[PDB]
Amino acid sequence: VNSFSGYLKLTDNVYIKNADIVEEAKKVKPTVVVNAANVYLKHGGGVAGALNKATNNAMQVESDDYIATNGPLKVGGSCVLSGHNLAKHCLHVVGPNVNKGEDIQLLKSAYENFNQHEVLLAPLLSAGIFGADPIHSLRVCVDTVRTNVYLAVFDKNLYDKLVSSFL
Numbered sequence: 588v589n590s591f592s593g594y595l596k597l598t599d600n601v602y603i604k605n606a607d608i609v610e611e612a613k614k615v616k617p618t619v620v621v622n623a624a625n626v627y628l629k630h631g632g633g634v635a636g637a638l639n640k641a642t643n644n645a646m647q648v649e650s651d652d653y654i655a656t657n658g659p660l661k662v663g664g665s666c667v668l669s670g671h672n673l674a675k676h677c678l679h680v681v682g683p684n685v686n687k688g689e690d691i692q693l694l695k696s697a698y699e700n701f702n703q704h705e706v707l708l709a710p711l712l713s714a715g716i717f718g719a720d721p722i723h724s725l726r727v728c729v730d731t732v733r734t735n736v737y738l739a740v741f742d743k744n745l746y747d748k749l750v751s752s753f754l
């Protein structure tokens with residue numbers, strides 16, 4: 588048992604809710620919140636901009652030191668950093684950005700990072716401003732992640748479409 592509330596169960600291990608991931612994280616304080624990161628960990632907008640804003644920019648300060656030491660992430664890759672006031676840890680995962688021409692095939696590699704964590708609160712990777720089809724992202728998530736994932740979908744119309752179209 589865990590403290591996630593109000594989720595619809597899609598599969599043995601995947602759950603989904605219409606929720607603002609920032610407010611969800613603040614309430615639950617999960618062990619792991621996933622960020623929709625880019626390779627430079629520049630949290631400007633989308634999920635990343637919202638999560639970083641909620642940390643009063645501490646996520647960005649930490650991220651800038653990480654990049655100065657380690658260089659950029661790979662598309663499809665990840666790193667574990669602090670969750671600040673939102674979670675124990677933040678798993679920054681880079682899904683492909685279709686609006687940059689990045690290979691959508693890398694979405695499966697991106698979701699594979701979730702399997703290193705027993706339980707996660709997450710957005711749909713490559714959705715939103717990353718330009719991929721969220722229905723596809725949900726399918727890849729269900730077919731790739733084997734650990735317990737709680738998906739927060741900000742947009743109510745999209746959430747309803749994802750549920751109603753789920754196979």
Ligand SMILES: O=C1CC[C@H](c2ccccc2)N1Nc1ncnc2[nH]c3cc(F)ccc3c12
Nearest residue numbers: 607608623633634637710714715716740741742
């Ligand atoms: O709901 C959906 C459908 C997919 C889309 C998405 C876009 C970018 C990254 C990851 C997912 N997206 N966005 C969010 N999903 C969950 N919590 C969110 N908090 C936010 C706060 C904001 F200022 C802006 C957006 C969100 C947001």
